[PDB]
């Protein structure tokens, strides 16, 4: 296959995503969810590992890390101290909504997928991050977790398999730094929410402690359908090495911004043009796609003619898929006050341990700020960019190359608009 | 705004606050909730209890904390300090928080922030003499593709323009309480021009499941 | 109020590679000497991973 899209109704992963039909147990188990749960987990943990490392199933997260290998990073014998799985449900990066969804309309998806991983990597139990500003998703989310643990789906003697697995909510306090792996356990913890530095991966010392395995929303949530049609289905979809389908949000200057299921290799513009209704004022007004949220770099109209939205791809393209959240800017759109605000939310948001990132996103603040109103000089520019090269990979998390990347895609593109913007600074004040 | 304390006599060490029994029970289920030896692991939840139970947090819910958990003070209050949603000043009955990131800012949603001033008489911060709103601004909360959004409380208001933020303050201000939804014609996360997809019902049980399961 | 001395050794540093030489060029010429050891850090065991253990008293409260 090179043609990709137009994924059919009957193989999406998130039935009911816009929550149509009921999401309780008894309307989830209607939909296929719980079903055979028990054959799943007699069959061994290592035919699960095998079957989730088939598919070809990568990190949706953001990283894109083969999650086959990473489960089975921590399949190894007890030592005494307690296997542990926990979900990330922050969501806290910009344009991104899916995970929302996901724990709001699928909340038996969830804890059946934490089941599965948890019966997968021999984990005791589960630990829900969720975050702080979703309250009622939480509710549902714990209503849902207590329906399964009265009908003998989870807890004691899980779905009659003699395995003992618990489900525990957490919720956040509000904080983006939070939703990393390593600042998710510390956060945990009842500490501050600042990440660790890897190694120790989280693999060997986790939570706790204990050894301890972070995965997605949605990663975890497609493993039961993983297990259950196969690992061959999944990776009948999409490029290789890029198999399986994406939620895709789409929002910012488009007609009907949107949450929605689609294949991995779709083209950027056939899925706007087809999901989101197209862009406002059609595709010549289009100026600037920010294809996987706010830590990928901007592309611009030309680069988005023919370009798939898989990981491949969009790193050859300078970027990254991220998340899949497309943020949209049309042509009257400011486009520099857009990377500034974005700057100016990196700033906000930052754990503040490390040097780096803690002086340099507030230093590219303050120019961007400056060159948002164009009281600057060219020469700065290239200096920005070297800025940039200070804080990507010296940094103890991503956070700074997620602030990094915005400011270098913004120049690499847009240096003429901020020559002009900076020109006409210098003439109307000077 | 700022991260350190002065002894206010409205806020000291020696203002009463204590937990009500229902409280006391839910956090020996909290710090039930977590093995053995790390009882510290409960000083998230339990310190946002206790502002659920007053709806600030003085430092008096910090000691308490500090004492139920056996933990030092300073560490509550850099858990307090760190996170933004502890209130460590009082703010007013209903807590409007408007994003206004790039996504929400693309949807118009200062046009929300200046509706708001302009309606409430007040500025980003300031809260009413009434106490009963207190406006500021926030980062992206998770619901980019219903934006421009607010959050009021635990409820979320999207898909709003400046006559239905308008109707949200006015029904606030009446006693009420509005549906937390968004207010356009869609419900959750569809497009506005009907379902794209998820179009035919649901297969159910037992489709596509493969052999030797 | 300024410091006067009346010691012409005051402010007399020698700089030597080795003890040896030091001892040697005390010797030779004729002061009375002490001499005292070198005293070298013992080696440490440094782990980032016991911050975070699960049963030993090396937690650390706070990051
Ligand atoms: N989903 C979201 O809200 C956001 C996602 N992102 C994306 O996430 C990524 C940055 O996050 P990270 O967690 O730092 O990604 P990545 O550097 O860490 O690694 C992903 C996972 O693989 C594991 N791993 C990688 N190499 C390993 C090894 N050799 N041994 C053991 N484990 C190993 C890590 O422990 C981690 O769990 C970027 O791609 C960024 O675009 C960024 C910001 C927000
Ligand atoms: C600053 C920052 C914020 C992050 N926020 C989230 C998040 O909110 N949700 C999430 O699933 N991953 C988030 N991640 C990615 C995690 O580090 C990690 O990749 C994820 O929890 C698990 O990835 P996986 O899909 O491969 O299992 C964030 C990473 C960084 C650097
Ligand atoms: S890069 Fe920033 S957010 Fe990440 S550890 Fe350093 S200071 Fe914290
Ligand atoms: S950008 Fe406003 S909710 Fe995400």
């Given amino acids: 296959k090179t043609s990709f899209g137009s994924l059919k109704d009957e193989d999406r992963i998130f039935t009911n995503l816009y929550g149509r039909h009921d999401w309780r147990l008894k309307g989830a188990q209607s939909r296929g969810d719980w079903y055979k749960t028990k054959e799943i987990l007699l069959k061994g943990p290592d035919w699960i590992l095998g079957e989730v490392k088939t598919s070809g199933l990568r990190g949706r997260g953001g990283a894109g890390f083969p999650t086959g290998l990473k489960w089975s990073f921590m399949n190894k014998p007890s030592d005494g101290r307690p296997k542990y799985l926990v979900v990330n449900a922050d969501e806290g990066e910009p344009g991104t909504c899916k995970d929302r969804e996901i724990i709001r309309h699928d909340p038996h998806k969830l804890v059946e997928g934490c089941l599965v991983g948890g019966r997968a990597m021999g984990a005791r139990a589960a630990y829900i991050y969720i975050r702080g500003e979703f309250y009622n998703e939480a509710s549902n989310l714990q209503v849902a977790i207590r329906e399964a643990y009265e009908a003998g789906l989870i807890g004691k003697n899980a779905c009659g398999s003699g395995y003992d697995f618990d489900v525990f909510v957490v919720r956040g306090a509000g904080a983006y730094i939070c939703g990393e792996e390593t600042a998710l356990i510390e956060s945990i913890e009842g500490k501050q929410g600042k990440p660790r530095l890897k190694p120790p991966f989280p693999a060997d010392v986790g939570v706790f402690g204990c050894p301890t395995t972070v995965a997605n929303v949605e990663t975890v949530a497609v493993s039961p359908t993983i297990c259950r049609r196969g690992g061959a289905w999944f990776a009948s979809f999409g490029r290789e090495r890029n198999s399986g389908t994406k939620l895709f949000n789409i929002s910012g200057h488009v007609n009907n911004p949107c949450t929605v299921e689609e294949e991995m290799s779709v083209p950027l513009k056939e899925l706007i043009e087809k999901h989101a209704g197209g862009v406002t004022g059609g595709w010549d007004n289009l100026l600037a796609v920010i294809p996987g949220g706010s830590s990928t770099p901007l592309i611009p109209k030309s680069v988005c003619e023919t370009v798939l939205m898989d990981f491949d791809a969009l790193i050859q393209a300078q970027t990254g898929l991220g998340t899949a959240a497309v943020i949209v800017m049309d042509r009257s759109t400011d486009i520099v006050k857009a990377i500034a605000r974005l700057i100016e939310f990196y700033k906000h948001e930052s754990c503040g341990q490390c040097t780096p990132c803690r002086e340099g996103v507030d230093w590219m603040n303050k120019v961007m700020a400056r060159f948002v109103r164009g009281d600057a000089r060219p020469a700065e520019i290239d200096s920005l960019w070297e800025i940039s090269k200070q804080i990507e990979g010296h940094t103890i998390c991503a956070l700074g190359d997620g602030a990094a990347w915005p400011v270098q895609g913004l120049i690499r593109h847009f240096r003429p608009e901020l020559e002009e913007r900076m020109q006409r600074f210098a003439q109307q004040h000077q | 705004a700022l991260f350190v304390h002065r002894d206010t006599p409205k806020n000291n060490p020696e203002t009463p606050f204590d937990f009500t029994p229902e409280n006391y029970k839910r956090i020996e289920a909290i710090v039930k909730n977590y093995p053995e030896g790390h009882k510290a692991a409960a000083v998230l939840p339990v310190l946002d209890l206790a502002q659920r139970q007053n709806g600030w947090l003085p430092i008096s819910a910090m000691n308490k904390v500090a004492e139920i958990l056996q933990v030092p003070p300073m560490r509550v209050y850099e858990v307090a300090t760190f996170y933004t949603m502890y209130n460590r000043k009082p703010v007013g009955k209903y807590h409007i928080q408007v994003c206004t990131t790039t996504p929400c800012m693309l949807r118009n949603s200062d046009s929300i922030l200046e509706a708001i001033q302009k309606k409430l008489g007040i500025k980003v911060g300031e809260t009413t003499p009434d106490k009963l709103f207190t406006l500021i601004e926030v980062e992206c909360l998770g619901a980019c593709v219903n934006a421009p959004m607010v959050q009021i409380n635990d409820n979320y208001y999207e898909d709003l323009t400046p006559k239905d933020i308008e109707e949200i303050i006015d029904e606030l201000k009446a006693g009420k309480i509005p549906k937390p939804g968004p207010r356009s014609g869609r419900f959750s996360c569809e497009p506005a021009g009907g379902l794209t997809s998820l179009t035919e019902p649901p297969k159910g049980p037992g489709f596509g499941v493969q052999a030797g399961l | ?63």
């Fill in chain 3, 1 to 63: 109020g300024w410091a006067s001395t009346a010691d012409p050794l005051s402010n007399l540093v020698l700089t030597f590679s080795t003890k040896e030489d030091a001892i040697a060029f005390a010797e030779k010429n004729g002061w009375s000497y002490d001499v005292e050891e070198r005293k070298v850090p013992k080696p440490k065991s440094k782990s980032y991973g016991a911050n975070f253990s699960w049963n030993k008293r090396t937690r650390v409260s706070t990051k």
